[PDB]
Write a protein that binds this ligand. Structure first.
Ligand SMILES: CC(C)=CCC[N@H+](C)[C@H]1CC=C(C)CC1
Ligand SMILES: [Mg+2]
Ligand SMILES: [Mg+2]
Ligand SMILES: [Mg+2]
Lengths: 351, 353
């Protein structure tokens, strides 16, 4: 693991994007964290959900928390209810993103069942489509469509990932094709615009553009920050960076530089395009980026903590410019789960 | 200004060499046999009263679209059954027609999801017809492939939706162009429909198929953007194409964007070969037959007026010029077919019967 080269880039992106979540107080975050968590936990604890969603209780609990965090810290300008509902949806998606089961047998009649109104055979679809309306009520038709599509894309993405395939050497189009499939880009980007706060028809071009640009910023920033936790990992192995290596036949270092250039560039352009656009829009966008990074740095899932401390023992300036940031975030978003994530889902389920 | 005839010619010959454009066993009699089968089933379909009244399209554009599509399917899906060509012809005809509705889908998409989950017929007439017909397309494929078709068609709907705004992207929004081309390109639909379950085992060739979907998506749309460039060069009506959006969004010259499209296309082509040459023989055949057919179709269908940019250079001792003409003569040789030989009777005639 190029812990070395790891420092190098993360610092660039952070310094160039200039990570700094100012707006949004700790009391406010906690208030939201608990609202979302609470509604989601009660949801996932219902018997139906409990029996159709096959997940180890502890992974569910962990996933839920990582997601409530992500939504609350990035969808900073939406209502509490919207955060809660988005938290449920993104929790369903994450539970699948880490799973393993062939969907072939349950997808054989997908379309006929869909058109007929019969409950899907794949349990996941049964639960997600049943819950979906609670997510969709927060948006206009256009945005809704994007959510529906991206979630469908995501299902296929997980399907493909089950083959643990990084692409045929020479298949340069494979990597990004896959990252987009399992990235939920359009889902994320469109869910940033609740109809209660934005007029889908008045800001159509703004919203469309944001969906298109955010799709890449969002996934590439995650590929970058995750360049730690995913690796000697099992469900990983097939990451955008690792697929670049396999498919583009280049070194891990070269793929790394690539991701970085795309990321930095994507970042530069997000600003260039939205700075002068509608203020409300620029705020939702800026608040998302800062929150998204805050979440990456704060959530243990990405073990970003180490690469701060364990690089705190060595002055390489590239490992010190990194640390100037981490804390900068942990002091805003570092919150003990005992302050919001309670009681555990399992406890509500057996009640 | 002035069509980059030379640069164009070069790229076109190169594109063809890379894909190994060469003669095949698909005979003219065979094509005609297929052309008529597909056209006939489709025309009878589109001529039914229900279809006739929910699909708002000028009879002549329907007729023209149907023909352009039957041609595209028959000439590119060369290895699939007649029935599959027919059914794909109906589906791709629905898709081509939707770019005729200026009608805002907003009011008809408000309850899209609740109606979908409940099993109630969609409010947008297009969806009502397409989803009703879809099964006839889906029976030809396994679950995985089916899903790709469903998704891409949904993406396509949104693509048309966005295109109604005639928006080429905010200057600086470098991600807009391709984001849009992919949305309205039907890539995954095309790429996945190339593998009928009757002829391919979706599970045995999963990686082959997935990879083809991913690579074909770009080859297919970029080749079309390229061949369609001449017809839309001076066309003041056409305004938001991949190339024109590159200009607006990337803030570069039409010539520079043209370069970008060419490099991606050529490169996409090189890699299609590099990856599939050594793979399963039947897979490489479906792929190769698609590329050659797709190009044949572009050159042969008048929709792209490629005929003109020939009658302008069929006499020049230039290398590219001559190769181009030889490839065109090859195309015509096997693809130039009078509509009176298959496209009959007209849809309108079956409708009023
Ligand atoms: C201009 C036409 C009809 C086809 C060339 C490629 N398209 C961009 C795709 C989308 C629309 C369909 C129906 C098929 C493929
Ligand atoms: Mg994934
Ligand atoms: Mg993952
Ligand atoms: Mg990642």
């Amino acid at each position: 693991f190029p812990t070395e080269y790891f420092l190098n880039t993360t610092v660039r992106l952070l310094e160039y994007i200039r990570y700094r979540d100012s707006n949004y107080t700790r009391e406010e975050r906690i208030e939201n964290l608990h609202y979302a968590y609470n509604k989601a936990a009660h949801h996932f604890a219902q018997p139906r959900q409990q029996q159709l969603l096959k997940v180890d209780p502890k992974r569910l609990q962990a996933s839920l928390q990582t997601i409530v965090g992500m939504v609350v810290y990035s969808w900073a300008k939406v209502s509490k209810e919207c955060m809660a509902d988005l938290s449920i949806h993104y929790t369903y998606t994450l539970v699948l993103d880490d799973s393993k089961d062939d969907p072939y047998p349950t997808m054989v009649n997908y379309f006929d069942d869909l058109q007929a109104g019969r409950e899907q055979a794949h349990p996941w679809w049964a639960l997600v489509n049943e819950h979906f309306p609670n997510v969709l009520r927060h948006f206009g038709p256009f945005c809704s469509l994007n959510l529906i599509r991206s979630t469908l894309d995501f299902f296929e993405g997980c399907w493909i990932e089950q083959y643990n395939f990084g692409g045929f050497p020479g298949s340069h189009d494979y990597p990004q094709f896959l990252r987009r499939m399992n990235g939920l880009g359009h889902c994320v980007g469109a869910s940033l615009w609740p109809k209660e706060q934005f007029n889908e028809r008045s800001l159509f071009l703004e919203i469309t553009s944001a969906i298109a640009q955010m799709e890449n910023w969002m996934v590439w920033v995650n590929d970058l920050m995750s360049f730690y936790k995913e690796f000697d990992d099992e469900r990983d192995q097939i990451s955008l960076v690792k697929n670049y290596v396999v498919s583009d036949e280049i070194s891990l270092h070269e793929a790394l530089e690539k991701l970085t250039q795309d990321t930095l560039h994507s970042s530069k352009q997000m600003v260039a395009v939205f700075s002068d656009k509608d203020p409300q829009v620029m705020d939702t966008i800026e608040c998302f980026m800062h929150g998204y990074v805050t979440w990456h740095l704060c959530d243990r899932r990405f073990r970003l903590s180490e690469i701060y401390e364990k690089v705190k023992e060595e002055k390489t300036e590239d490992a010190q410019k990194f640390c100037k940031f981490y804390e900068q975030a942990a002091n805003v978003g570092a919150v003990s789960p005992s302050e919001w994530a309670y009681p555990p889902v399992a406890q509500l389920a057996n009640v």
